[PDB]
Amino acid sequence: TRSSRAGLQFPVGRVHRLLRKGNYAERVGAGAPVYLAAVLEYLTAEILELAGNAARDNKKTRIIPRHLQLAVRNDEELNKLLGRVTIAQGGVLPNIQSVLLPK
């Protein structure tokens, strides 16, 4: 398997298959599937890392969409990446304006 040859977890073969069966170019390079899968695996590791930390904070083992929402929105770059994306059952960050606070 080409995934084992690159030390990656995501299937390089399935990536190469989807790149050919999607009509993006006449030909598909050999290093592109390995390099596209590596970015995907890195980004999934980024989210799962912050999601597991949010899971530890909520004292729960299984990651729920609440954890994904908190993880993506607390990161400055993951928020910019998924800026036009709504996560199901995600909710919003706790935020109350200063003027609205009691005085």
Partner: protein
């Protein structure tokens, strides 16, 4: 039908958004905005069902209409 979303439902949506005091005309104005929003999304959703030759709008059609409407949604398909 449209009056099925009133009184506490429009109040609960405000609390999750952080609103403290709600004027009386917000409720009617909120329904109008939600009406126009639903009209736009369902229109593009129905359009895909028309091209697909189906009488049932699938979850994909809702997602794909939201994607075209700049409202990408995760959770209800690929």
């Amino acid at each position: 039908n449209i009056q099925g979303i009133t009184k506490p439902a429009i109040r609960r949506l405000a609390r999750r958004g952080g609103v403290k005091r709600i004027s009386g005309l917000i409720y009617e104005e909120t329904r109008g905005v939600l009406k126009v929003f639903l009209e736009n999304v369902i229109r593009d959703a129905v359009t895909y069902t028309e091209h697909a030759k189906r009488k049932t709008v699938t979850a994909m059609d809702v997602v794909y209409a939201l994607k075209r409407q700049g409202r990408t949604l995760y959770g209800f398909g690929g």
